[PDB]
Amino acid sequence: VRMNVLADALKSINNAEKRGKRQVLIRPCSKVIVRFLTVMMKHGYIGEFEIIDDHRAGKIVVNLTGRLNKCGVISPRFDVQLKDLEKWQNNLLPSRQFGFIVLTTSAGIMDHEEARRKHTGGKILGFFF
Amino acid sequence: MQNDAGEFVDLYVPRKCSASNRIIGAKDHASIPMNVAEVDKVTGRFNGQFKTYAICGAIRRMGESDDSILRLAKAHGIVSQNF
Amino acid sequence: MGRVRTKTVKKAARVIIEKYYTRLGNDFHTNKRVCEEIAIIPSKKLRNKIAGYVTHLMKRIQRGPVRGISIKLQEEERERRDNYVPEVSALDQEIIEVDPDTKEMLKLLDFGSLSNLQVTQPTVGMNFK
Amino acid sequence: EWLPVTKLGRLVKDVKIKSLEEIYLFSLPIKESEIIDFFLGAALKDEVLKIMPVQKQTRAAQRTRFKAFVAIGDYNGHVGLGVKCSKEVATAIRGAIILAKLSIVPVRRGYWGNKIGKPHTVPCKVTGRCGSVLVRLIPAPRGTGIVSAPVPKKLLLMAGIDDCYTSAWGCTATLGNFAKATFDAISKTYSYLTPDLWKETVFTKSPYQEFTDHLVKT
Amino acid sequence: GKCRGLRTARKLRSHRRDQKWHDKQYKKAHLGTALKANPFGGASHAKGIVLEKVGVEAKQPNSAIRKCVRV
Amino acid sequence: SGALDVLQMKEEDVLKFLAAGTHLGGTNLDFQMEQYIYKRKSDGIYIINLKRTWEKLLLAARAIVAIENPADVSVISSRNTGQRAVLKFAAATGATPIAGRFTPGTFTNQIQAAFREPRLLVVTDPRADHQPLTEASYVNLPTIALCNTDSPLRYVDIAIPCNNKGAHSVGLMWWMLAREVLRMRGTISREHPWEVMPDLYFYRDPEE
Amino acid sequence: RAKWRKKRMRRLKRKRRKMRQRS
Amino acid sequence: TKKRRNNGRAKKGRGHVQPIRCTNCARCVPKDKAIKKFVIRNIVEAAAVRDISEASVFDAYVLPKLYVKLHYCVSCAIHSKVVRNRSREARKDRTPPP
RNA sequence: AGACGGACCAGAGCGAAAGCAUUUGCCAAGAAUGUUUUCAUUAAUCAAGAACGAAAGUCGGAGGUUCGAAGACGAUCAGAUACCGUCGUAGUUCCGACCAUAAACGAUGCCGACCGGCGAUGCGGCGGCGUUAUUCCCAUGACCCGCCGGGCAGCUUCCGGGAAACCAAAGUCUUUGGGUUCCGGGGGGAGUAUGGUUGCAAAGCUGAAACUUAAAGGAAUUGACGGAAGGGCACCACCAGG
Ligand SMILES: [Mg+2]
Ligand SMILES: [Mg+2]
Ligand SMILES: [Mg+2]
Ligand SMILES: [Mg+2]
Ligand SMILES: [Mg+2]
Ligand SMILES: [Mg+2]
Ligand SMILES: [Mg+2]
Ligand SMILES: [Mg+2]
Ligand SMILES: [Mg+2]
Ligand SMILES: [Mg+2]
Ligand SMILES: [Mg+2]
Ligand SMILES: [Mg+2]
Ligand SMILES: [Mg+2]
């Protein structure tokens, strides 16, 4: 069973983009994805996305422009404590320049840089580059 | 690539594809740029201006170079609506 | 108890014809002499065997071309029969037999030209598995 | 002296092409080591790595042949690898030097933290494989030096890399695969797509196409 | 596969415990059987008395006599 | 590329396509050759659209015209059918032909006898002439083909839906292709009809 | 062969149980 | 090393199958192994045909046939020179000869 | 009189697996499809524990054609308490209780998603030219032509992996984390000794240590060999003969 709504979508983004597609459809269409996608788009890694509505979970479509390498997820949602960022981000990322670990927190869903500029930690969700 | 003095390093910048935004390597011997001619709009007769379309190996091996170029052309004020 | 010719014998027989097809004829003892006169072989017996294959070979050249022997006279008679054109073949009879499905495509392609359509039939198609 | 058999050789014998970068920009195969000795001449040093005596049985007795491994580079961003086997070890060594010049590549370099000076290490971490061995290259600050076994250390200096870490997996004690993996690694640096890239291309004129005139025998 | 939860620690910690005994060195050390059966009581050296002098033969591809003593 | 312009299917070429059966494919269909289809009739013979097959024929020509030295181009037909058309197509634009028994290694193996490094490759059949399509992967070459509805489409960049079985259709398609490349570049006017006949490219079986 | 190595043992293991049941 | 993918027997999705017995060997083998063969031979075999049909009582007497189903072992077959070993790539043909 | 249910029998179906084949009648269950019915998160996997479990085997009755461990003979053999041939006990058959093992193999845990094509086959539903059907035209299969679901399999490929053989899963794995269960850690000693537990017995489950040893092993390659097969060859081989 589908005990996790975010894990599957990023896989189905990653595989398609690893192939050479231009669009994809991912089904369950939940709130937390929307934030996750918004922050990717904001930094520029993807295009727009149109979210189909039905009186159910919903559905959704994205446009890629596949300049993305891998999109990832970390489960279980661990708990960060604002001194361990360095130890997480050196051994998940390829370098100290680019790549973003995204985390939920009391202020919202944000990347790690913004968390440090606001001086707050939270719980970890995934990562992309 | 730039230093903190706006310079340029990385002795060249590798040509990307146009159809997947994937990079072409120094040993990808199944890559092509492809020229195509433009006309005078009254009587054929190529006049001197041509374009360029670049393809990588993976697309050319899958069997999808045909439509990629086609939809590249279908946008560029070149092959019209087939309908 | 067997008699096969080797590469040296055969190849020279080929080259001799491909130069001197006019000197030679269908008689062995003349073909023998001319080969002596043009070419300088070290041995009387090698002289013999070459000519014997030459003469066998001429009788083939009389009718039917051969793989590795390009002769002028044959090659122009080819060339005539290559440039041969008929008077008319693509103007078939001023009636073109056509089917309804084409006529729909033609109609969509804006043509009400001269054509025909007289076909209906049940489906048979494939063969016995 | 040397006569070019083909187009590309005829041009480099002339002064039309100026460098090697353009050749790589269009991914053109090269099949003549006389070219490499033209552009890269005397800035290029070589060394053998191992000589491995394989052999085979037949009806009479074993027949042995000597195989050879060679690495070549200039310490400014080029590196080559070559292999070959034959009966005489000198002829073995000679030919593999030719293949090594031939299958030469570029190698990209970048910074760790802040961008002051020239690059000293790799931009991003990469990997490679060949048959039960995997290798992983990692950036480092400016001064650590390379930490690895001797084999890739001999090879990474030839690229002109200054500092790096290193890790490995599998049966490292087969040198042939252990060598080619780290070479696969530093080959695929100009294939990783960063945000430094993502600017459109300014397509150039394909040297065969622009110098058509001189080629058609004038 | 692997358990991999957020509150699974008792299971994993347990699993490593009972499954570590299947290693030869750990098992040898942390059980007293090799220790109480070692002639040296967990020690390096030891003094003792001679009572014979014999010669031990060697393995196949070599051939010699190695001049040992019963102690 | 057939844009909206003077060049477009008038009334005469259509009569020719219909005459030679250049709109009937085979029965079986590839998933790559399924956008160049109009319909399937009662019998399993599919109808090809004579709008896209003319709007890609131009595109192949515009590729060739880009290449100013014609002798770099090469044309292949190993099969008996397209033999004659190719030799006249070579003559009528200055290409370099290869007919029958393509020997492997001709584009590799610099020290071979018949070595040659071209820039563009034209073909009658991809399923029979499947070596050079391969050997154009060890060497950068753009690749053009004449392909039927059932045709494994690989390593190729410009497909022209035809009926590559019938002698009439094959040599006909070359006649058109030779015609445009000269119109686009040369003395042919594009108005008044070109002299030679499209029967010159047929394959004549030894009947008389 | 292993079927017979298995079978030789049972024949023995009976003799041990039989011998040991006397006491 | 799987020499075959079928494992030599055309089971594919049962669990169990009945056995049969070799016609020569007399041994117990499944029905999906155990090469099959079918005989439609005549009774007189191409030699005495003229003699009978001239010494008959009827008029040309169409002369019936004889029908048999045969089962063979794998071992007994190869010794009978029915089938033969093959090379690696040619093992993968499921076609009988003409 | 007692067993067995041929050919039709298929890389076809059903079942949790073991396994299931003559006709008819009865008894109670089930998958898939169809659904603008209903309840409203009720679920996935699972220590302890519980049902089922080929053949052999054990227990008590009935029955006992055929085959046949043991067993006795005749042959071959240097010897054969084996391969072969003739006889022939337990058993093989049914009713009722025990035991709980197998190359019990897809040698491949269950759930869920994603990832390329092609032609078929079996069930159900939806459609369409036409042929028959039948007895005057319809709803039944049968084909003809397609579609959709969830099934047993198959061919093809630089998807991608892998020590390779190979595999649309053994893929989406140094760019390492979907959820969870059981289990392995050089080779032998050894599934042995002992202790506990079940069982009528045979045996099953749990399960060591001293000592010994530097290699055991997997996939593929080149030779050699073969009382393995297909082509040829020689009086230092044969046939016929001196
Ligand atoms: Mg250890
Ligand atoms: Mg079974
Ligand atoms: Mg249990
Ligand atoms: Mg039983
Ligand atoms: Mg029984
Ligand atoms: Mg009884
Ligand atoms: Mg008997
Ligand atoms: Mg078991
Ligand atoms: Mg098992
Ligand atoms: Mg594996
Ligand atoms: Mg892991
Ligand atoms: Mg062990
Ligand atoms: Mg084993």
Author numbering:
A (entry chain WW): 2 to 130
B (entry chain VV): 1 to 83
C (entry chain RR): 1 to 129
D (entry chain CC): 59 to 276
E (entry chain XX): 2 to 72
F (entry chain AA): 2 to 209
G (entry chain n): 2 to 24
H (entry chain aa): 2 to 99
Please share excerpts from the published article on this structure:
BlaS is a peptidyl-nucleoside antibiotic composed of a cytosine, a pyranose sugar ring, and an N-methyl-guanidine tail.
In the Empty-A cryo-EM structure representing ∼35% ribosomes, density for BlaS is observed near the 3′CCA tail of the P-site peptidyl-tRNA. This leads to displacement of C74 and C75 and distortion of the 3′CCA end. Interestingly, we observe a van der Waals interaction between BlaS and the sidechain of the terminal valine (Val68) of the nascent chain which further contributes to BlaS coordination and to distortion of the peptidyl-tRNA. An overlay of a previous mammalian ribosomal termination complex with accommodated eRF1 (27) with our Empty-A structure reveals a steric clash between the distorted 3′CCA tail of the BlaS-bound peptidyl-tRNA and the M domain of eRF1, including the catalytic GGQ motif of eRF1 responsible for peptide release.
